[PDB]
Design a protein around this ligand. Sequence first.
Ligand SMILES: [Zn+2]
Length: 182
Amino acid sequence: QRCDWVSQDPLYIAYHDNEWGVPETDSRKLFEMICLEGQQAGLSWITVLKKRENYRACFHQFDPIRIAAMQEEDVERLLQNTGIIRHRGKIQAIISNARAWLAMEQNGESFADFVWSFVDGQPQITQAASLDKIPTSTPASDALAKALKKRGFKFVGTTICYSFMQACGLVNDHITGCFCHP
Ligand SMILES: [Zn+2]
C-alpha cells in the first residue's frame, strides 16, 4: 500500500516512493525544495513535479549565487518560458529566496540547521492511519513561515512551509499503512 494522495502517474509514484518524507540535510537541496514548494501555491504538486527539470534548467540548477544575480530582464525572459510557471511573483520569489539564502549562508548560518531547528532537529513521525488526520499546517510551520518571511524569503506561507517539511522529511507523514512508513 502507498499513501492515498499518490496518483497512477509513474513520475509521481517514484517521487512518493523515493523522495517524499526522506530526510534532506543538504542546504542547497533544501533551498531548491522551498522554491519548488512556493511554485506550487494555488496549484497541484504534479504540475510542479513535471516541470522540475525545466526549473533546474532555467534557474541554474538552483545554484543560489547565479540565481541571486538575476535581474528584471531575466524575469521577462522567464515569463516567456512555457516549461515553468509563468507568474511574475513566483519567478521573483525564487530570486528573492536565493538572495535570502545567500545572506544567511554568508553570515555563517546554515539553511539546513535553520529549517531543521523548527522540528527540534529530529524527523517527527506520524501516527495517522488516514490523510484526514494529517494537518496541512502546524505551530511549527507557522513559526518557520514567520522566520522565513522576516529573513526575506517569498512564497513561504505556513501551508507551503508544512508541505516543504513533509517533502524534505522534517516530518514523516506517510500513513501507517504505507510501505514507506517506519
Ligand atoms: Zn507513503
